[PDB]
C-alpha cells in the first residue's frame, strides 16, 4: 500500500530534489522534440529532421503511454478515484483527456504514415500540445483564473472602452484619408478593414510601420488617439500585476496552521451531533443527565451551535484583518464588564 | 408549509417564556442552564448575533424562521465539512486512523464522550488500522 | 403592477441567466451589422453588403424603436419617472438621448435614401453608436470616471511633464537635423510639425519607423529622451491599474449589510423629529412627561442628535479602517472607567 | 442677525448653569436628565465631540454658534436622508409598505411611539398597501 | 491692506471658478503662440507667421511684464517677502528667475530684430519656456520629486541593471554580425555605436525597424534580450505608478484637521517656557507657588516636556497607523491598571 | 588599528560626501574608457583610439591593481577575514573574483599585445566588466534577487502562459501564410523559425516591421494574439514594480531600533544559560538558592525560555502588523482579568 | 566640557534621591509632585520613554547626558515650531491676531496664565490688530 | 532512542504531579515557584503557547517530545544568535568591549549575576580592551 502512495507522490505531487530533476528532464526532452519539429521546415536541414523527429516520436509515444498507464494506477492509490468508475473519473480530468488524446493520436498518425507527408503535417502540431504536460496539479491556471475572476468588472470596463475608442478613431482615420496616395504608388487605406488593421496595430503600441497616415488631419487624429487610448489596452497589465502583488502580500499574513485545528474539530463534532439527534433512539441524548417537551429546544440549539461553529471556522482560514481585532476587543470587554458586574452584585449582596 | 410554521411557532413560544415578540440573551441562557450546560456570557452572544440579520441584538420571529428554515444540507455545507477533515489527514489520501480519529474527536473542541464516539465509528466503514474513508461520513451526514 | 416591474427588471436591471443571453444576442446582432458595414467598403463584396446591411438596418430600426417605446413604460414603473413630466425626465438621461437620436436618424436617412450614396455614407457611422446601447446602468463609465477623479492631481502632473519633455526634445531634434538628407532622396525633418509627429510617435513607444534621426547629435537626443520620458506617457497605465486593484481590495472589507440598518433607522427618526418640533402643536412633545422655558434646549438637543446620527450613519457605509478601532477602544475604555468610578464612589459611600 | 445671536446666547446661558465660558459633558448630562432621558456616558461624548472643532473636549460660544447656524437643509442632507430610506425598500422602486414602515420605525434604533408614528403617516401620501412614496417625506422634511 | 491680499490670492494662490478661467485663458494664449511658432517653419504659411507671431510676441511681452511687476507687489503682501531685500528674496524663487529671463530676453531679441532672422531663430525657443508659466506654486514638481526621492534605491537598481544588460547584449550582437550584408547593399552594424543605437531602440520597445539583426545568432540574442530586459527599462513606470496610487490611498486616512490644534498649542507653550526660564528674573517662575536648589530640576523638566510635546505633535500630522493603536491601548490599560491598584490599596487600608 | 578601519570604511562601506565623489570619479573614468573603446570601431577615429585607450588601460591596470592590493588589507581589518585563510575567504567573494580576473587578464593581454589586433579584440570586452566594479556591497543585486524570490510563482506562471501563447499563435500564423508573396518579390514566412522570430518581435510590442502578415487570416490571428498575450509578457513589469512599491511602504513602519535591544540581550543570556547547564560543575546553579531530582526540570525550563526568547526576538525585527495588536490585547486583558480575580479572591477572604 | 558634565552629574544626583545608577518613573513623579504639579501616570511614562534609547524603561547617566546635550536650537526644531504657528493663521500671510493669539495660548493645551502671556506679547512686534509677525517669535526663541 | 524517550517520560511525570495526560499553566507555575522564581501570569502562557502545535492551550506528551527533541544546534539558531550580537557592536567589526559586554549583559533583559558573567568571559578570547571576538562565543555555544 506504500508503493502506490510513493509512486503517486512521485508523479502527481512533486516535492524535493529527486523528482524536480525528472520533470525538468522530461520538459527538456519535449523542448528538443519541438526544436527538431522546427528544423523540419528549414529547406537545408530537412532530410535529417524527418527521420530523427520520427524516431523521437516513436520513443516518446512509448514513454508517455507507459507513464500514463502507470499514473492511472498511482491515482488509483487515492480514495476518490478508487474502483473502476473511480479511475474513469480520473481520466475525465482535463489534463488526462489531453494526455490520452496526444498519445493515441500520435500512435495513429505514426502507424498511418509509415507507408514529410500529412504524417509530419500533423505531428508538427501534436508535438506542441505536450508543452501542457509539464504542470500536473494545474496551479498556474488556477491562480490566473482566480485573479482574473476577482477583477472581472475592471477588465470588462477597460476592454469595452478600448474597443470603442479603437472603432471610432479607426473610422475617423479612414474618413480623413481614403484617397491620399502613399509616397510610393500604392493607396493604403483603400478599405475600412485596413483602417481597423492599422488601429489594432497602433493601439497596442506595436507600430509595424506598414500603414502610416498621410494627411495632417489623420496625423492629428492618430496623435490624439495614441496619447489617449494606449493607456487602456496596456492597462490590464497593471491591474493583474498589482493584484498578484497584493495577493502575495496576503500570503505573509496567514494564521499559524495549528490555530485552526480546534475550529475544525468543533465543526465536525457539532455537525455530527446535528445528525445523531434525528435518531431519537441514539445515545447523544446521554449528554443531558424521561424528557418529552424538551426535544425541540435541543434540536434548535444544535443548529445554532453548528452555524456559529461553521462561522468561526470559515473565519479561521482567512488572513488577519481588522474584523478580527474589532470583534476580539468587543468580546473581551464584554467578558470584563460581565465580571465587574458580577463582583458589584456580590459586593452589594455582602454589604446589604 | 402550515404545519412547519406552526411547529416553529410552538418552539418559539417554548423559547420565549417571557411575554414578548422577541428573544434576548437572558431567556436563551435561562433555557440553556435549564438543561445543565453552564455556558459562558460570550458564547451566548455568539449564538445570538449570528441568527438575526438586523443587528438589533435580539431575535424576531421572522429571523428565527429564516434561520430554522435554512437548509443546511447543500454543496457549501458539504464542502466546508469535508474540508474540515483534511486537517486530520496525513498524505491527504482521504484515510484517517481510527485511533487518531477517536483521540482528536474525544480530546479537542467540544468534548464528546465514549458512547457517542463509539456510536459514530460503528456506523461507518472500518476496514483496519486507518482506511476510515471520511467520504462515507460526509455523505451519511449530508443526506438530509 | 407586477408586469411593469418585471419588464423593467428585464430591460434595465439585468439579473440571472435568462436576460444576459438576450443582451448578448442583441450585442452580437449589432456586431454582425458592424461587420457588414465593414464589407460595404471592400470593392469585391460591395453589391451584397449594400443590400443585406440595408435590410438589417430596416429590421434593427423596427426592433430598437419598439424596445425604446417599451422601455419608456417599464421606466414608467418607477416613482421618480412617473407621470408625463416624469417620463420626460427619463428621456433626458444621456443614454436615452443617444438611443432616440440613433433610432430616428436611421429612420430618416433610410427613408430619404430609398430613391451606396449618402445613405450608406451616414449609416456607416450610425451603426457605430449602437455599441453604446449595451451597458444600460452605465456602471463602466461611472467606475472609470470616479477612479480618474480620485487621481486627478497625479494624472495632470504626469501629462504636463510628458508634454513639456515632448515639446523640448522635439525642438532640439529639429534643430540638430533640418538639412541632413535621408538615405534616399527625401529630407525628413523639413519642418517643426514633422518633428512633433516624430516625437508623439516615439514617446508613446510605437515607432512607425518612417522618421528616424540621422545625425549623431539627433541620435543622442533621441536615446536620452526615449530613456527618460517614455516612463511618463506610459505611467498613467500603472496609476489607474493600481487604483483599480486597491479599490477592489476594498470591496472585500465591507461591513455586513445588516450592520447599517439601525443607523439608518435612527437617522430617519431623528431627522423627522427635528421637523415635527417646528410645529409646537404637534404630539412629539409627549415624549417628555406645561413647559415654557424648556423649548429651546430641546430644539437644540434634537439638532445635536441629528448630527451625531448622520455621522454614525455616514461612518457605517465606509469599509473597516483604523479609525473604527481607535474610536471603539476609547469608547469602551471610557465606559469601563466610568463603571469603576461608580463602584469606587458606592464603596466609599458604604465604608464612609 | 442680531436677534438670532441674542436668542442663541440665551440658549447658551440656559445650557451653562455654571458660571463659565464653556460647556462640559457634566452640564449637558445634567440638563438632559433634568428632562428624564437617562442617557449613557458615551452618547454624551458622542454629542459633544461632534460640535467643537478644536478637539478641546468642551464647547465654546463660537463653536456652538457655528453648529446651531449650520443650515441642515441642503442637498447633502437631503441626499443622505434619501439614501437612508433605500435600505428599507424592496425592488428600489421608491415604495415602502406602510406596515413595514411602521414596524421598522417603531421597533428599531431610537424607538418612537404610537402617537408619533401615527402622526408621521397621516401627513403623507398613503394610497394602499405600499405606495408610500418616501420622496414626499424627504421633500416635506427638507423644505426648511 | 486687503487689496494686496486679494490680488495675491488671485495671482499666486488660485481658488474658485473666477481665476481658473483666467489662468486657462493665459495658457490657451501661450498655446496659440506656440502653434504660430510652429507654422513659421512651414514653407507654405511662412510670411503670415513671421508677422502675426511678431505682433503676438509684442503684446505678450507687454502683458507678462505688467503681470510680473504686479506679482512683485502682491507677493509684497506676505511677511517673508516684505521690504526691499524681501522682494529680492522673492525674485530669487526659480519660477521668478524664469519669468524675468523670458520677459527681458524677449524684449531684447525683439528690439534687436526690428532692423525670419536670428530674431525668430531665438523666439522659436523663447516661446517654449512660457509653458512653465502655468503652474505657480509648483505642486506638480514637488509631488514628483518627493515620490522619486522615496524610491531612489529601486530606481537606481533598475536603471543600473537595464544599462548593464543593454551594454552586454549590444556588444554580443555586434560581435555576432559585423559583416552580414543587409537584404539591400548596405552593411548595417558597421560599428559598435550603431549596435548601441539598435540596443537603445529595442530595449525601450520602440522598434524603428531600421536596424534588424540578420544572422540567426543575432536573432537568438535579440529574442532572449528582448524577453528579459524590456521588463526593466519599462519597470519604473510600475514603481512610480503604484507609489502614486498608495500615496493617494494615504490621503483618505488623514486625521481631522481639528485633531492637531491642542498639540500645536502645547508645543508652542512649552517651547516658549523653555526660553523664558533662561531669564531668571522672568515671571514664569510664578507657576510654582525663595528657591535656590530647585532651579535645575525645573530647567530639565521643561526640556523633557518640550521633547514629549514635539513628539506628540509630529505624530499628530502623519496618518492613522498601527503604532497609534498599539500605543493607545497600552496607555489606556496602564491607566486602568493604576486605577484598580489604587482601589485595591484603599480597600486594603479600609479592611486592615 | 584605526588606520585599517578608516580605509575599509572608505573603500568598502561608503558614507558621507568625501567618498561618494571618489567613487563617482572612478565610475566616470570607467565610462570614458568605455567611450574610447567605442570609438575604436569607428573607421574615422581609429588611430587615435588604439593609442589613447591603450595608455588608459595601462594606467587603469596600475590603479585597480593597487586598489585591490589595498582592499585585501582593509578587509583584513575585519574579524571574519583575518589571517591568511581569512583573506583567502575574502578573495572568494564574487566581486573579488571578478576584480582579480579583470586586472590580471588586462595585464596579460596588454603585455602580450605589445609586439588593433587580438589585444584590442579582447580589451573591448574587458573594459565592459569593470562596470560591475562600482557597487561594492552588492545591495542592488540582493534587493532584486529577494523581490524576485518572493514572487517566483507568479513570474513562472506568467512566463509559461506567454511562451505557450507565443508558440501556438506563431504556428497558426505560419500555417495561415507560407506561400503568400510579399508586396516585393520575397516570400517572408518561408520557415517556422521566421514565424517564431515574428512572434517574439510582436509579443514584446517592438514591431520592427520586417515581417508583417499578408493574408487576412493571418491578420485576424495577429490582431487577436496581440490583443490577448502582450498583457502577459509585459505583465512582470507590473508585478515587480508593485512589489518594490509595497516593500518600500514597509520601510516606513519599522520599529524603533532601540525597541529590540532587550530582546537580543535576553536571547543571548538564555542561549548562554542553556549551555552552561550542560556543565554540572558550573556556577549557573547559584541562581537557585544539594539538589538531585531537580536537574531535569531546570534543564527543560531553560530550553522553553530560550525558545520563547528567540520567538520574541524574531518578532522584534519584522515591521508592525496586526498580529502585534491581536496578541498584545490578549496579553493585557489576561493580566487585567488575573488582577481582578486576585482582588475578588482577597475580598471573599476578608468578608468570609 | 568638564564643568558641563559635572553640572549634569549634580543634576542627576538631585533627580535620583535613591541610591542607584538609574532613574525610574517613581523618582520622577516624586520630584515632580515635590513642586506641586499633580501629574498623571501616563505623562510620566511619555516623558521617560522618550529619553532612553534602550527600551529599558529607565534612564541611565549616558542617555540622560545624550538628551540634555541635544542642541534643541537647529533648523529642524525651528522648522517644526514655525509650522506649528500656521495652524493659527488665516490666509497664511504670517500674521496672527494679538487677541486670537492670547486666546489660543491661554485657553488650549498646557494653560499658561495672564502674566506669562502678557510678558510674551510685550517682547515682540505688536503694530495693531494683527500684524504680530510670528517670524520674530520663532527667531527670538531659536537663537540659543 | 528508547532511553531518551523513557527519560523524557520521567521528566514529564515530574512536571505533571497531577494525574492526567497533559500539562497546564497551573502545574508549570507550581513547579516554577517551587524553585523560587516568582514568575508572572503572562510569561507562563508565553512559554506554553509556544510548545503545543494544536492551539489547545495544554501540552500533550507528543508535543512535549517534539519540542524537547528539537535540535536547537543548527544553522538557523546559530545565525539568529550571531545576529543578536551585532546590535552590541560599533563599526560591525565583530569586536565587543569587554566592559561594554559585561554592562549590557548584567544590566539588561534577564539579569545575570557577577559569577555567571565572570565565568562567561573567562572562557573566551580576551586580548585587551575590546578584541572579544564573539565568533568564539557563537562557536562554543553552538557546538552541541
Ligand atoms: Ca422574551
Ligand atoms: Ca432583530
Ligand atoms: Ca459650564
Ligand atoms: Ca473647544
Ligand atoms: Ca533611582
Ligand atoms: Ca535604559
Ligand atoms: Ca496535569
Ligand atoms: Ca495541545
Swiss-Prot record, chains A, C, E, F:
Domain of life: Eukaryota
Effect seen on changing residue 339 to S: In LQT1; uncertain significance
Catalytic activity: K(+)(in) = K(+)(out)
Residues binding a 1,2-diacyl-sn-glycero-3-phospho-(1D-myo-inositol-4,5-bisphosphate), per UniProt: 137
Reported impact of residue 323 to W: In LQT1; minor changes of wt current (homomultimers); positive voltage shift of the channel activation (heteromultimers)
Stated consequence of mutating residue 339 to H: In LQT1; decreases interaction with KCNE1 C-terminus; does not affect plasma membrane localization; reduces IKS current density; impairs binding with Phosphatidylinositol 4,5-bisphosphate
Known outcome of mutating residue 199 to R: In LQT1; uncertain significance
Mutagenesis / variant outcome for changing residue 247 to R: In LQT1; uncertain significance
Ranges where the record places region Interaction with KCNE1 C-terminus: 319-352
Region (Interaction with CALM): 263-275, 299-313
Mutation effect (residue 151 to N): In LQT1; uncertain significance
Phenotype upon changing residue 136 to P: In LQT1; complete loss of outward potassium current; enhances outward potassium current when co-transfected with wild type; decreases plasma membrane localization
Effect annotated for changing residue 195 to V: In LQT1; loss of channel activity
Effect the entry attributes to changing residue 180 to E: In LQT1; uncertain significance
Principal subcellular localization: membrane
Other facts noted in the record for this chain: Mutagenesis experiments were carried out by expressing in Xenopus oocytes or COS-7 cells KCNQ1 mutants either individually (homomultimers) or in combination with both wild-type KCNQ1 (mut/wt homomultimers) and minK (heteromultimers).
Comment on protein domains: Each channel subunit contains six transmembrane segments (S1-S6) with S1-S4 forming one voltage sensing domain (VSD) and S5-S6 contributing to form one quarter of an interlocking pore-forming domain (PD).
Membership in a protein family: Belongs to the potassium channel family. KQT (TC 1.A.1.15) subfamily. Kv7.1/KCNQ1 sub-subfamily.
Subunit structure: Tetramer. Heterotetramer with KCNE1; targets to the membrane raft. Interacts (via C-terminus) with calmodulin; forms a heterooctameric structure (with 4:4 KCNQ1:CALM stoichiometry); the interaction is calcium-independent, constitutive, participates in the proper assembly of a functional channel and also acts a calcium sensor. KCNQ1 channels interact more strongly with Ca(2+)-CALM than with apoCALM.
Name of the featured protein: Potassium voltage-gated channel subfamily KQT member 1
First and last residues shown, out of full length: 104 to 568 of 676
Curated annotation (Swiss-Prot), chains B, D, G, H:
Posttranslational modification: Ubiquitination results in a strongly decreased activity.
Modified sites of kind Phosphotyrosine: 95, 134
Residues annotated for Ca(2+) 1 binding in this entry: 16, 18, 20, 22, 27
UniProt effect for mutating residue 85 to L: In LQT14; significantly decreased of KCNN2 calcium-activated potassium channel activity; not changed KCNN2 expression; not changed KCNN2 location at membrane; decreased thermal stability in presence of calcium ions; decreased interaction with RYR2
Sequence positions bearing N6-acetyllysine: 17, 90
Position(s), cross-link Glycyl lysine isopeptide (Lys-Gly) (interchain with G-Cter in ubiquitin): 17
Matching SUPFAM superfamilies: EF-hand
MF terms in GO: adenylate cyclase activator activity; calcium channel inhibitor activity; calcium channel regulator activity; calcium ion binding; calcium-dependent protein binding; protein kinase binding; protein phosphatase activator activity; protein serine/threonine kinase activator activity
Sorted UniProt keywords: Acetylation, Calcium, Cell projection, Cilium, Cytoplasm, Cytoskeleton, Disease variant, Flagellum, Host-virus interaction, Isopeptide bond, Long QT syndrome, Metal-binding, Methylation, Phosphoprotein, Repeat, Ubl conjugation
A biological-process GO annotation: regulation of cell communication by electrical coupling involved in cardiac conduction
Residues recorded with modification N6-methyllysine: 111
Regulation: (Microbial infection) Inactivated by S.flexneri OspC1 and OspC3 proteins, which specifically bind the apo-form of calmodulin, thereby preventing calcium-binding and activity.
Stretches for region Necessary and sufficient for interaction with PCP4: 72-144
Protein residues bound to Ca(2+) 2: 52, 54, 56, 58, 63
GO cellular component: a single term: voltage-gated potassium channel complex
Position(s), cross-link Glycyl lysine isopeptide (Lys-Gly) (interchain with G-Cter in SUMO2): 17
Residues reported to bind Ca(2+) 4: 125, 127, 129, 131, 136
Residues with Phosphoserine modification: 77, 97
Pfam families reported in the protein's UniProt record: EF-hand_7
Modified residues (Phosphothreonine): 40, 106
Domain notes: The N-terminal and C-terminal lobes of CALM bind to the C-terminus of KCNQ1 in a clamp-like conformation. Binding of CALM C-terminus to KCNQ1 is calcium-independent but is essential for assembly of the structure. Binding of CALM N-terminus to KCNQ1 is calcium-dependent and regulates electrophysiological activity of the channel. The C-lobe interacts with KCNN4 channels in a calcium-independent manner, whereas the N-lobe interacts with the S4-S5 linker of KCNN4 in a calcium-dependent manner playing a role as calcium sensor and gating the channel.
Family statement: Belongs to the calmodulin family.
Pathology linked to this chain's protein: Ventricular tachycardia, catecholaminergic polymorphic, 4: An arrhythmogenic disorder characterized by stress-induced, bidirectional ventricular tachycardia that may degenerate into cardiac arrest and cause sudden death. Patients present with recurrent syncope, seizures, or sudden death after physical activity or emotional stress. CPVT4 inheritance is autosomal dominant. Long QT syndrome 14: A form of long QT syndrome, a heart disorder characterized by a prolonged QT interval on the ECG and polymorphic ventricular arrhythmias. They cause syncope and sudden death in response to exercise or emotional stress, and can present with a sentinel event of sudden cardiac death in infancy.
Gene (name only): CALM1
Amino acid at each position: 500500500t506504500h508503493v502506490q502512495g510513493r509512486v503517486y507522490n512521485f508523479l502527481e505531487r512533486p516535492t524535493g530534489w529527486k523528482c524536480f530533476v525528472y520533470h525538468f528532464a522530461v520538459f527538456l526532452i519535449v523542448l528538443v522534440c519541438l526544436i527538431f519539429s522546427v528544423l523540419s521546415t528549414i529547406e537545408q536541414y530537412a532530410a535529417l529532421a524527418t527521420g530523427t523527429l520520427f524516431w523521437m516520436e516513436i520513443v516518446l509515444v512509448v514513454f508517455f503511454g507507459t507513464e500514463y498507464v502507470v499514473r492511472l494506477w498511482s491515482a488509483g492509490c487515492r480514495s476518490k478515484y478508487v474502483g473502476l468508475w473511480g479511475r474513469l473519473r480520473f481520466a475525465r480530468k482535463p489534463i488526462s483527456i489531453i494526455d490520452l488524446i496526444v498519445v493515441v493520436a500520435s500512435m495513429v498518425v505514426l502507424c498511418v504514415g509509415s507507408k514529410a507527408t500529412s504524417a509530419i503535417r500533423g505531428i508538427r502540431f501534436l508535438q506542441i500540445l505536450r508543452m501542457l504536460h509539464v504542470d500536473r496539479q494545474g496551479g498556474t491556471w488556477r491562480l490566473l483564473g482566480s485573479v482574473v475572476f476577482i477583477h472581472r468588472q475592471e477588465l470588462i470596463t477597460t476592454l469595452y472602452i478600448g474597443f470603442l475608442g479603437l472603432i471610432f478613431s479607426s473610422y475617423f482615420v479612414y474618413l480623413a484619408e481614403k484617397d491620399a496616395v502613399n509616397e510610393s504608388g500604392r493607396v493604403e487605406f483603400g478599405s475600412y478593414a485596413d483602417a481597423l488593421w492599422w488601429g489594432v496595430v497602433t493601439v497596442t503600441t506595436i507600430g509595424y510601420g506598414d500603414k502610416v497616415p498621410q494627411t495632417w488631419v489623420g496625423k492629428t487624429i492618430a496623435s490624439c488617439f495614441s496619447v489617449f487610448a494606449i493607456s487602456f489596452f496596456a492597462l490590464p497589465a497593471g491591474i493583474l500585476g498589482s493584484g498578484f502583488a497584493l495577493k502575495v502580500q496576503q500570503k505573509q499574513r496567514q494564521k499559524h496552521f495549528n490555530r485552526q485545528i480546534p475550529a475544525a474539530a468543533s465543526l465536525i463534532q457539532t455537525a455530527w451531533r446535528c445528525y445523531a439527534a434525528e435518531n431519537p433512539d441514539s445515545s447523544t441524548w446521554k449528554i443531558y443527565i424521561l424528557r418529552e417537551h424538551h426535544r425541540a429546544t435541543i434540536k434548535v440549539i444544535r443548529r445554532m451551535q453548528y452555524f456559529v461553529a461553521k462561522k468561526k471556522f470559515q473565519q479561521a482560514r482567512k488572513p488577519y484583518d481588522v474584523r478580527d481585532v474589532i470583534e476580539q476587543y468587543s468580546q473581551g470587554h464584554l467578558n470584563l464588564m460581565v465580571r465587574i458586574k458580577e463582583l458589584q452584585r456580590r459586593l452589594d449582596q455582602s454589604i446589604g | 408549509t402550515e404545519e412547519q410554521i406552526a411547529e416553529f411557532k410552538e418552539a418559539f413560544s417554548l423559547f420565549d417564556k417571557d411575554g414578548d415578540g422577541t428573544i434576548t440573551t437572558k431567556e436563551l441562557g435561562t433555557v440553556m442552564r435549564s438543561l445543565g450546560q453552564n455556558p459562558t456570557e460570550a458564547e451566548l452572544q455568539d449564538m445570538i448575533n449570528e441568527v438575526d440579520a438586523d443587528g438589533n441584538g435580539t431575535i424576531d420571529f421572522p429571523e428565527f424562521l429564516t434561520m430554522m428554515a435554512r437548509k443546511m444540507k447543500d454543496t457549501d455545507s458539504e464542502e466546508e465539512i469535508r474540508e474540515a477533515f483534511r486537517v486530520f489527514d496525513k498524505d491527504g489520501n482521504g484515510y484517517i486512523s481510527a485511533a487518531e480519529l477517536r483521540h482528536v474527536m474525544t480530546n479537542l473542541g467540544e468534548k464528546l464522550t465514549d458512547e457517542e464516539v463509539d456510536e459514530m465509528i460503528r456506523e461507518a466503514d472500518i476496514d483496519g488500522d486507518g482506511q476510515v474513508n471520511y467520504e462515507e461520513f460526509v455523505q451519511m451526514m449530508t443526506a438530509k
